[PDB]
Write an enzyme that holds these catalytic residues in place. Structure first.
Site, PDB file in Angstrom:
ATOM      1  N   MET A 189      28.902  -3.025  30.695  1.00 18.55           N
ATOM      2  CA  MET A 189      28.620  -2.368  31.992  1.00 18.55           C
ATOM      3  C   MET A 189      28.160  -0.894  31.857  1.00 18.55           C
ATOM      4  SD  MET A 189      28.856  -4.930  34.129  1.00 18.55           S
ATOM      5  CE  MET A 189      29.050  -3.970  35.612  1.00 18.55           C
ATOM      6  N   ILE A 204      26.205 -11.929  50.421  1.00 21.62           N
ATOM      7  CA  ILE A 204      25.707 -13.175  51.000  1.00 21.62           C
ATOM      8  C   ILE A 204      24.857 -12.985  52.253  1.00 21.62           C
ATOM      9  CG2 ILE A 204      26.551 -15.101  52.469  1.00 21.62           C
ATOM     10  CD1 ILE A 204      28.515 -15.726  50.193  1.00 21.62           C
ATOM     11  N   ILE A 260      22.519  -9.991  29.286  1.00 23.66           N
ATOM     12  CA  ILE A 260      22.810 -11.242  28.599  1.00 23.66           C
ATOM     13  C   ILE A 260      24.208 -11.160  27.998  1.00 23.66           C
ATOM     14  CG2 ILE A 260      22.014 -12.925  26.933  1.00 23.66           C
ATOM     15  CD1 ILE A 260      19.255 -11.945  27.219  1.00 23.66           C
ATOM     16  N   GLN A 288      23.207 -12.901  23.086  1.00 23.03           N
ATOM     17  CA  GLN A 288      22.326 -11.861  22.639  1.00 23.03           C
ATOM     18  C   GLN A 288      21.788 -12.216  21.253  1.00 23.03           C
ATOM     19  OE1 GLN A 288      25.174  -8.511  24.820  1.00 23.03           O
ATOM     20  NE2 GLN A 288      24.006  -7.861  23.026  1.00 23.03           N
ATOM     21  N   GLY A 310      16.541 -13.673  21.368  1.00 24.14           N
ATOM     22  CA  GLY A 310      15.146 -13.451  21.782  1.00 24.14           C
ATOM     23  C   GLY A 310      14.857 -13.914  23.205  1.00 24.14           C
ATOM     24  N   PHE A 311      15.872 -13.949  24.077  1.00 22.90           N
ATOM     25  CA  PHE A 311      15.731 -14.457  25.454  1.00 22.90           C
ATOM     26  C   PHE A 311      15.205 -13.417  26.454  1.00 22.90           C
ATOM     27  CE2 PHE A 311      19.954 -16.910  24.799  1.00 22.90           C
ATOM     28  CZ  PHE A 311      19.295 -17.896  24.083  1.00 22.90           C
ATOM     29  N   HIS A 321      11.797  -0.189  24.020  1.00 20.65           N
ATOM     30  CA  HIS A 321      10.742  -0.992  23.378  1.00 20.65           C
ATOM     31  C   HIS A 321      10.521  -2.337  24.096  1.00 20.65           C
ATOM     32  CE1 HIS A 321       9.025  -3.523  19.933  1.00 20.65           C
ATOM     33  NE2 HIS A 321       9.701  -4.424  20.623  1.00 20.65           N
ATOM     34  N   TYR A 331      11.290  -3.351  27.348  1.00 25.91           N
ATOM     35  CA  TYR A 331      10.701  -3.252  28.673  1.00 25.91           C
ATOM     36  C   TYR A 331       9.227  -2.930  28.501  1.00 25.91           C
ATOM     37  CZ  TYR A 331      15.568  -3.272  30.316  1.00 25.91           C
ATOM     38  OH  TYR A 331      16.882  -3.543  30.557  1.00 25.91           O
TER      39      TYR A 331
END
Lengths: 169, 170, 170, 169, 169, 170, 170, 169, 169, 169, 170, 170
Positions: free
Chosen positions: I27, I49, I88, I93, I96-97, I131, I133
């Site tokens: 966080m 909601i 993630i 982690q 490579g997602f 890098h 983004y």
């Protein structure tokens, strides 16, 4: 035979009523739209609970099987009249019960609730439900013209009545 | 006459209605008990605010006299029908107003609300009111036997109606 | 006399009601404690507007002076009975008003509400309330032994009644 | 005999109260419409939960069978007076139980609630219940003409009563 | 075939409605964001529970497999007009079911709700659905230019309609 | 002319709104029933303040006389479309005002709310509403057959529209 | 004297009570802290409205002077007892009012409320108030040791009482 | 022996308290009416939870069996006094516990809550519960005359007190 | 591979999110305090909601295992921008997602929600998330100085943006 | 050792918190009445759910045994100051755990909440806890005379404190 | 100048704010849509009442002129930062007030609120406002590309900030 | 002097309170932010009426001019301690009032509320508040290092106290 009894509609009974309420072929004869979510039902049951202007009854036999539904509604206490409505479930029609049940409603209306007049509506194209009410002492005071849209057309209903002084004696 | 106007009933009109609502020889004609706290009336008016099933109208003339009241109640939007009722304040009757008033109600019913059938209940023993209705195009469809307890007696009334088709092709 | 009328109890009548409801030698014959905030009156008035089981009426003379209170309470719509109770303001007693207002109670009960029985309770030590009721047709059905504590002791009250049929055909 | 307990009505006695509140024969003797959905009963119970003007008692035997109901209603604390009513369950009728339930509710009224007068209302057509009350010390103080509509006719009722000094002396 | 029932949407159909309301491919054809938590759906259902301006129908087969949804929304009772929309479940696509669901919702609109006009909105890029509607009697009354943003581009939509006299004559 | 401005709809404007909302021959071209309590207006005004999907505007002349109503309604922020509807008070029609106020609607939609499409509905029997919209750039995208019941019959309306890019570079 | 009247406390009286409620040498005598917002008092008065367990009374004379306050609190309807308390506004003491005031309270207690026992608490160090009570028929039944912390010291009080029997057979 | 402990009254404990509350022979000595629905109880428990003017304790032993109930009520924080109430359950009387428990209440009142005075009421016809309190350092400051109606008659109670400076030293 | 899917955050998912929310190491990179009771969570879920200014997504694979969380927040509908946030989970982690997921968010932002600009913040001492983004078409428009206190010191973040006209083409 | 986790207090830690909140010995050191029904605790928890002015932490070991509580209360965001308090469970006492819980709450205060000063209050009769605090860097800033009434006597307390620059430099 | 005062915004000030809030060439500068019912504003003000995350201030001079408004919004108490914004009512600009006003805001921020960083957003095309800020000690930290849609175009703004350290050691 | 009295804080006192609560160089010695809506005052006043843990007092001179505020806050009824805080209105300082009002605080605490300890916090840079407290019997129990941020920096405050027994027998 005369094993049929009338009782207060209960919460446990709402699935049976939910079924009748969504049946197109049944609710047509009450001129009520065949669409009702169980939730909407549950709620309008909660509403009818604190309402002195109606009494709803579930009709049972000795197996305690749900045979049908009698309703006395719009009880009006100055004028001493109410509207009567009856349904027998599909699998319990044909058995000759309607007289019994229609008469218990009157017994209710006239010996307990102390009403002067019961009235009802029925489609003029229900020529045999009409014979019935007449057999039970009802007579036509009205032929209401194009009152209700039912199954794609405006239809005529008769209004029919019986008074307390007639039924008593 | 051609100067009578129908407008939605407002909160500023509830003293006019209160009086009418509490008058014995006026409520008999609607079969309604002549007893109502201004406090009950106001609250009913606020729940009326919310009702698509009714239109309550007030009747004025040229110089703002409140002449009466017209209602279309129990408006049903599948069956496309409503009960009509009318009152002319005691001091405004017998002027030939009713006729125009019943005919503003029907035109509302049938040109805006697009209803199919207006119906009304009227005492058998109110034969002047019966003859009005018939002359506007209402025909009897039932003879309701002893329907209302009014002035110490159970009493018969006539159910009458007129259809949209007949009004527009008047 | 012919002047006198009953109408629904209104909010602007509560000062006059409150006056009467804190009067001891008045409240004593309604079997009621003479203690009531203007604020408890207002809430209890708000309570009982909606209450179909009761009707409270103020009487007015031709000049709209508050003359008294007429009430029909416990109205049951199965048994078609209700209890009657009346007060004439102290400064208007001894005028010959009593029978007119009892008669109005019965008129309303029998010709409007379509009741079968009207009953009341009157103290056995208030003879001439007992005697006015007699002259209006009320007959004793019971002597309630030591029913209420009033003024330092348990007192006996009469239960008295009149039916719809008797009222309406005598 | 001394084998009867009275105690406060609990939520778990409601199925039992309900069944009684829908028996027409039983409810006739109470001047009372025999129609009450369970939900309406539980709302009424939830209400009187906080009415110091009423007390409701289930009757139990040793084995703790539910014999009946006893009520003190309309308790008035200026006038020190309340109305008494009693039901025994159909199944527990005619075992000489009622006299004990009566002297029981009297003892509560007089020895605990410190009341002054208890009254009841009983059908003039029920001289056996009237007998019952007379033996437990109740005195007729009124004959109410056509007070109640029951079973198609307006009937008369005895109002009766007993006082504290009489029950305790 | 005649083996399709329409009925009111119940709380137990919500997992099913939810899954459809988060399928982007399906919701594209409805001009509709494909995001809806379950809780938000159940709040929306709880709301329309009381909207006489809308009707929602699940489609069931004989075995009572959930085939789809049909809706009449924005029902207007002066103008007697409502919008029609239909989804069939991906798994039940391409079995010639849709014509039956359409004539079904039309029959409800015209034979029960006594409506005057039904319209719908359908992608100009979906000439197979348009075809579908044309066969069931729908007439194009508008070509809305760049009415909806779907899939990175502003697209055109056909508004179409059918009337009561046409469907019932 | 250059005097005219739109501003947010305020509570003290509701008398003027109510006037217009019970006007029949005005309400008819908004496809709206001419029936509305001052009280239903007030609640519906309280409703729609918070409603991000709408903006209601009163127009004022240089002297702050209420000239009309401009509204942008159903504003959807994904599709970036909204419906436009306007009324000029009866006593201010025929002045040449119409285009200025339509232009203000489009200005607000395109330069403030950053909308892509503005559409309206206009009766096919109100030619010169149809023709003013044309001169402001609106083109017909649809002819809605028998869409509304108005004045005793089902009438046809035009759906018309104008895009952001066209408005802002012509 | 024969002109002092007891009436239910009203909302128009709460400035009189506020002052009393905030005065140090008056509240000491009731063992009550001398501190109260008019806003707290009013709300308590509204919850008092609802209490059958209390009667708060205001004391007037001939020409409307508010002379004081009498309460019957903790009214218990099984045990049929209540605590009594009294105040004479500073400017009205030493006129021989108290006597009549205590004796209106008992007559209320015992002729209307039909209580059995009134009791009171009074400071040992208030021997004038003790002697009043004794001369009205209150007798001590307890010597409460150091019951209240008042003016910087724990202090003894007398519990006194009188029974319905003794008052009515006075 | 001194295995007895005092704890905060909890929700799980309400059945045990419900029992004591409806016991005529137990509640007489607290001058409290023996009538209390579990619901009314649950609620007044919910009430006592946000109330700084009372502390209610359940008294347990090492089996964790409910032995009794001590209460300190009407805690008043200017004057620094409270009313003390004690009940030991029927099956736990006779065992000589009361001293222990009565002393823990005082320990509570004087070492924790920092009160100046504990007081109590007891029936003059409880001549032995009186010996007890006196053994625990309580003395009579009052003989309250006909204070309470208990079991058909008005009865005398003593008021009894102990102060902080006495108990401490 | 491209089995990863984005879905609406649901109630069933809150335990997984509750875990991420209390993770200090996770966080920190969202500049959000690592403290959140499940209750507080449940509630702020209930809040989100009925909120059109956010969309929260749970990222899953084909086992339906929770792989991560994408958020688009502060959707502003005049200006057509939103803030993007991605996490993630620890065990997912390195695989490579992030590219895939970051691109689905953009697809969401630009092909569905019809936004003009996505922006984000990241710590300048996250030189490699940066890098990333940038590899996905984001560029720095800001170097915000001492914006956030993170792990005992004020730190710099870059603000980074991508517009609709860039991503489309 | 580094085997202690701090985390937000959850609803499932309440039985544990409750037990501590009714231990008089433990609560003495907190200046605190040892009485708290469960229901009152859960209402207090439900309340502080939304107090940004307070943080409550359960301590867990590796196996996730509940060791204790740590709290930062009265957090003030102008003044950047909060009160620290710690309980260790009786069962986990005397294992040299407290120094780690202290430096833990300090690190939260200073490295996450970015606070300026932490203070605490500790009994002058507890020179071992004072010792404890002194080793973790707390400086006595007051000697409060007869601040608390505990165990029948008014006692003195040390107020102590530590600052951010001191803990982080 | 040395006579301008900052005070908390009050309910008596909401007509001043309403006007500002509805003015096109003033709200553009805050990037805020120029449309707000007095009824929306008031309610927002009541929820503002409750917010520790904001301080809204009104700006007066010697003889009670409302000159403007200053806000510190999104106050974050861990990160110890807030967004600052400012308005000078149209009739009060170009008097050299802004300077003093921005500098009262910072002193509040940093001497009372004890924040660490104030930041602001300002239009690239508002280069007078940019130069004010720079002369008070704000330095740019970002060039936000096309962040706001204002007057029909997406537009760039500068993010600027100043730190507590730099203000106190000014 | 002998004129001066404390009484409960009332609603009509809030203008005077609000004045003081937005005063910076006043609020600074209560360690309180000088920012408060009249509306937040009113709610917070509604909050704290019922709050048994506090008593707020306004002081009045013989002519009922509002002289200051005395408060006893955090009143704990187990430990019997409370915090004292006072303000004299700027236009009434330097009169010799201070000791009288501190003395009244202690009187109330010790003779009415029956407290054992009264404590306060005073800035170490407000000597002559520190010195007046000394002359009323307060002694330092603590030096709170860098306790509050006030006027751009962390400042030290004294914690000072006085017991019941000492006050009441010196």
């Amino acid at each position: 035979n005369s094993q049929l009894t009338l009782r207060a509609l209960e919460r446990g009974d709402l699935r049976f009523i939910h079924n009748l309420n969504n049946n197109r072929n049944i609710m047509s004869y009450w001129f009520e739209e065949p669409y009702e979510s169980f939730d909407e039902l549950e709620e309008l049951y909660n509403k009818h609970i604190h309402d002195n202007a109606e009494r709803r009854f579930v009709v049972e036999d000795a197996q305690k099987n749900l045979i049908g539904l009698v309703e006395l509604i719009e009880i009006n206490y100055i004028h001493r009249s109410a509207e009567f409505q009856i349904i027998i479930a599909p699998e319990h029609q044909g058995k000759g019960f309607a007289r019994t049940l229609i008469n218990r409603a009157l017994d209710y209306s006239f010996t307990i609730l102390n009403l002067h007049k019961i009235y009802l509506h029925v489609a003029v194209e229900n020529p045999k439900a009409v014979h019935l009410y007449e057999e039970c002492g009802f007579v036509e005071e009205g032929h209401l013209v194009e009152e209700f849209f039912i199954n794609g057309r405006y239809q005529d209903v008769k209004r029919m009545y019986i008074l307390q002084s007639k039924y008593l004696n």
